[PDB]
């Protein structure tokens, strides 16, 4: 099985922002480099919160909220300084942070 | 049982009244809120007037009482007896 060379990770709370922002990033990476892969999807996280629904009392009835956090990896086998440069020049997302750091 | 884990206690808080009281051996009741503090050998023969949230209680400090904190000899709560209810707090 494969050895991790480098980690590209895109992180968002919003599900629509992370697919689109990836779809441009992968395009930008093929246009400005020669060795790219289709973004491994990687499993989505979901955090559980419960709060009241009335201002005071009515204990029984409750309210539940969820927030998901989505991960894309791309997996460029070598990113060039000119791929990373195009990536940051053609960035336009808000929903997403892209990480070129690893861990 | 419970303890003070691993680090060194005299209480920081009690220390500044005590160091001047030991110099005399014992002097007038040291006005203390520091019920957080334990009893030790240096403290044998002092008189600690120990605030309980409502008022001070004099604890005479002595060798048979070194296994304890100061806060234990001065009470806090009131207990309703049950022949008939408790009228008073007890010191």
């Amino acid at each position: 099985m494969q050895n991790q060379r480098i980690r590209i990770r895109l992180k968002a709370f919003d599900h629509r922002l992370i697919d689109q922002a990836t779809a441009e990033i992968v395009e930008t990476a093929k246009r400005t480099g020669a060795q790219v892969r289709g973004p491994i999807p990687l499993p989505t996280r979901k955090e559980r919160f419960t709060v009241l629904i009335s201002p005071h009392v009515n204990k029984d009835a409750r309210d539940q909220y969820e927030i998901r956090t989505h991960l894309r990896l791309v997996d460029i086998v070598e990113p060039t300084e000119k791929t990373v440069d195009a990536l940051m020049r053609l960035d336009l997302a808000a929903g997403v942070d892209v990480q070129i750091s690893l861990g | 049982p419970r303890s003070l884990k691993k680090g060194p206690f005299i209480d920081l808080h009690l220390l500044k009244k005590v160091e001047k009281a030991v110099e005399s051996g014992d002097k007038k009741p040291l006005r203390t809120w520091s019920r957080r503090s334990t009893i030790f050998p240096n403290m044998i023969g002092l008189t600690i007037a120990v605030h309980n949230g409502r008022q001070h209680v004099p604890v005479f400090v002595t060798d048979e009482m070194v296994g304890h904190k100061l806060g234990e000899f001065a009470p806090t709560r009131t207990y309703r007896g049950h022949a008939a209810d408790k009228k008073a707090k007890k010191k």
Partner: protein, 100 residues
């Protein structure tokens, strides 16, 4: 609720940072298990009496907006009622109603 319970904390956090930060590890080195047949002398540890309200064990903070005690949520910096109000209005990114 009151502005005083938040005012008390706000003075506590400037003093926490002033005395305790350089002294964080003065506990592990001088007190805990790393202090095996080393120090454990009171005379270097007698200096924490002024930071006594600023201590990490009373940094329970509660809601940031109001000073209202109890029922806090550290991830919003808010509480139950006031979380619900911000989720109701779409103020929080990605936060939606649940179904499964």
């Amino acid at each position: 609720a009151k502005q005083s319970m938040k005012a008390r904390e706000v003075k506590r956090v400037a003093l926490a940072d002033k005395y305790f930060a350089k002294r964080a590890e003065l506990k592990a080195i001088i007190s805990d298990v790393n202090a095996s047949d080393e120090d454990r002398w009171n005379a270097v540890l007698k200096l924490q009496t002024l930071p006594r309200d600023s201590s990490p064990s009373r940094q329970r903070n509660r809601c940031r907006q109001t000073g209202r005690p109890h029922g806090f949520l550290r991830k919003f910096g808010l509480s139950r009622i006031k979380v619900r109000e911000a989720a109701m209005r779409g103020e929080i990114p990605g936060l939606k109603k649940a179904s499964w």
